[PDB]
Paper text:
The spliceosome, a multi-megadalton ribonucleoprotein (RNP) complex, catalyzes nuclear pre-mRNA splicing, where introns are removed and exons are ligated together. Highly dynamic RNA–RNA and RNP networks form the active site of the spliceosome through a series of compositional and conformational rearrangements driven by RNA helicases, providing the necessary flexibility and accuracy of the splicing process. To ensure fidelity, the spliceosome needs to recognize and discard suboptimal pre-mRNA substrates while it assembles, is activated and eventually catalyzes the pre-mRNA splicing. Here, we provide high-resolution cryo-EM structures of such so far undetected spliceosomal intermediates that contain suboptimal splicing substrates, isolated via the RNA helicase DHX15 from the thermophilic eukaryote Chaetomium thermophilum (C. thermophilum or ct).
In addition to the ctILS state, cryo-EM revealed two novel spliceosome states, refined to a molecular resolution of 2.9 Å and 3.5 Å, respectively. The two complexes contain the snRNAs U2, U5 and U6 and a fully assembled catalytic U2/U6 RNA active site, which is docked into the central cavity of the closed PRP8 structure and stabilized by NTC and NTR proteins, as well as IBC and IBC related proteins. As C complex proteins such as YJU2 or CWC25 or C* specific proteins are largely absent (except for SDE2, see below), and the pre-mRNA contains an intact 5′ss and has thus not yet undergone first step catalytic cleavage, we conclude that the isolated spliceosomes have been intercepted/stalled at a catalytically activated B* assembly stage. In addition to a pre-mRNA containing a 5′ss bulge, we found disassembly factors TFIP11 and GCFC2 in both quality control complexes, and DHX15 as well as DHX15 docking protein SDE2 in the ctB*Q2 structure. Since the DHX15–TFIP11–GCFC2 complex is known to associate with ILS spliceosomes primed for disassembly, ctB*Q2 might represent an intermediate nearing disassembly, while ctB*Q1 could represent its precursor. In the ctB*Q2 complex, we could unambiguously assign both DHX35 and DHX15 helicases, with DHX35 at atomic resolution. Within the ctB*Q2 complex, DHX15 occupies a binding site similar to that in the ctILS complex, interacting with SYF2 and SDE2, which is normally recruited to the C complex after step I splicing reaction has occurred. DHX15 is fitted rigidly due to lower local resolution and adopts a similar conformation as observed in the ctILS complex.
Numbering used by the authors:
A (entry chain L): 529 to 720
B (entry chain q): 1 to 139
C (entry chain r): 1 to 96
D (entry chain t): 1 to 141
E (entry chain s): 49 to 96
F (entry chain K): 117 to 174
The structure:
Amino acid sequence: RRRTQVMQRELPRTAVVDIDALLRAADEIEDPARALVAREAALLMAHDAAKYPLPGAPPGVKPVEIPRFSDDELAEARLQILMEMKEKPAPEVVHAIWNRREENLNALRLGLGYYDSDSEDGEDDVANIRATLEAALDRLMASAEKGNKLEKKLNLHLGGYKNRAEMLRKKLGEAHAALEKARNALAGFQVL
Amino acid sequence: MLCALSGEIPEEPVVSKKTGVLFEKRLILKYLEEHNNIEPGTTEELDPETDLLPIKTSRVVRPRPPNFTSIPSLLKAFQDEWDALVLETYTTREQLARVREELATALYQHDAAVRVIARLTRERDEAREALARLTVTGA
Amino acid sequence: MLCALSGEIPEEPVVSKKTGVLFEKRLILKYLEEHNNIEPGTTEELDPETDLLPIKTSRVVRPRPPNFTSIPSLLKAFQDEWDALVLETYTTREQL
Amino acid sequence: MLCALSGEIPEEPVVSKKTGVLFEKRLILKYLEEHNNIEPGTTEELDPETDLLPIKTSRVVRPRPPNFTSIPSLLKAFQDEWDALVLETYTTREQLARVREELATALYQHDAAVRVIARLTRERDEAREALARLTVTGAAP
Amino acid sequence: ETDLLPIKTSRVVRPRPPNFTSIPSLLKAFQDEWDALVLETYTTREQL
Amino acid sequence: AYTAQAYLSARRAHLALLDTHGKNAWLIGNWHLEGEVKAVEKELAETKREIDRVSLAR
């Protein structure tokens, strides 16, 4: 419970999190409350990586100590935030906003996580698209190699069964032709 | 296919006119002689000479083997793959819509919490300034 | 048993009450519509609403080949099957 | 109308008796099998034998384009449609992953804001207690 | 008021027009073409 | 590249399902094909027997 909530929740954000660079970016924030929130989020991400290392992340991440806070203080903060919360937008409004985002920006552009709203430069978008294409090509090559190995193993396992099925089908076709010829011969023999 | 009682491909299959369940001729005959002409799993009585109809397979058409490379089999496999992909896309879209609604609610709550945090920081700074002034004046 | 109209195992088999010939339900309905409700290969009229008995059994599952595991491979196989069916129909017409 | 699960007009659609949402019979049956009798878009359980009712109407005639009069053109059109559907599914999966990552970042920021708000409330309470103690100890003129 | 039930619409998916490019429509057309070819081949086989 | 990766993932899933159920699928298909071939051979044998009986009577 002392660890980060995102660590115990689903959909992990990043296996590798840099506390120092995120804290330096938090110090560059002009708004003081936003800077404090970003620094605390960096500390929470570092504690989540240290306490709950995701698959592929390096181990031995150093944890960060934090002061103890009562649940009553968190409940009071949540009540204050709910009192300060305005009217929630309807689901239709959020759906229309998402549809406008998917109509103005491209669906492939919206799917890519490097397409930010403030990234109007074509060079940065082109570099991000090139990096994403290189990563996708590497992943596709690895998947193709794994699928080729699996297909080779399956073919080596089931080639005899396939050959037996083909031979049985050919024998069945020859038997059907012979049966038709025999039926014709029987009809002719009866007439004769 | 398969037989209901024997569990294998019936050499001389027959179909009950009441239930439509295929069965082998000899096994169903012995069961009807042993179960007083009553079908298995049903309390209805089936006539061994009337309710049973033989199944005939004319060899006029070319016998297509039931392989996965068959054209109707390929069509059925394509339909099944399309249905599975549609179900997966529907589940993924439902999960994405739920995640987007949760992210929008989290963004609104984060904006409210940032406003509350700024107000609390201003109040704490004012209280610290008042405490410092009281400590300086309180000689 | 296999469908007499399709040449393979019917997904929804139906049998005539008098002829007792297994066929696909859609194929039997199309043949009845295209021949004024007449059993194919016979001179006796067939009623699809009363004389057709559906077959309630399990579905036969074809073994998927290792090569036929991709959408483009499936499309190529479907094109080859359609071309083979067209060639077989043309050869059957010429032989007739 | 179009089916709710697929977005296209089903050939043999059925309607739920609770919400009145049109769907395909096979797709709804597969979804109920996969989700253990859960209706799409809600959490209520609708029985396909009872809550799902078929609609008896005339078949809508789809206008076949003149391009779809040959085997190769129809095959190319079907291949293009399948490729478009596969690309749409991959884009939907990538967008869902990006939305999940963004929601995780937003939840981390919200938890950080809650912790900072609790810390600021504790600091403000301590400062207010110190100010009250100084005012009680001090002699106000 | 009781026997008539209204029909609701969900906008989870985009509106696809009922054209000839639909996957299910293409599958139905291919099945109909296969059935017609099978009927023609069966008539030709009976004649042969 | 995304379409190719989706196709590769679908092929990998199909290969995994094939490795899971290949023996059952091949056995069921072989049993059905053998039953159909046996039925066709039985029909041909019955026709040949009837033809032989007619030939003997003639």
